[PDB]
Nucleic acid binder design. Structure first.
Length: 34
RNA sequence: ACGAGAACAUACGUUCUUUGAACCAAGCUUCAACUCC
C-alpha cells in the first residue's frame, strides 16, 4: 500500500457512552499441575 | 527256395499325501486462518 513514516499504526478496538480502546489478543495465563 | 516262417515289450497303476504368505509396524511428523490496506 502507500508508504509512510515509522511507525505505521497499532490496532485497538472500539466499544461505546465512550470508546475504551483495548488491544486485541492480550490475555492471562495460569498453570496448575495435573 | 535267405537259421528260416509266423509273434504289438505288451497288460494293470491318480505325481499323489501333510501344510494359514505368515509374522512384527499409529498415515504420521513440524503448522495460529492469518496478513495488509
Amino acid at each position: 500500500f502507500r508508504t509512510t513514516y515509522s511507525k505505521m499504526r497499532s490496532v485497538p478496538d472500539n466499544v461505546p457512552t465512550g470508546k475504551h480502546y483495548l488491544e486485541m489478543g492480550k490475555a492471562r495465563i495460569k498453570l496448575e499441575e495435573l
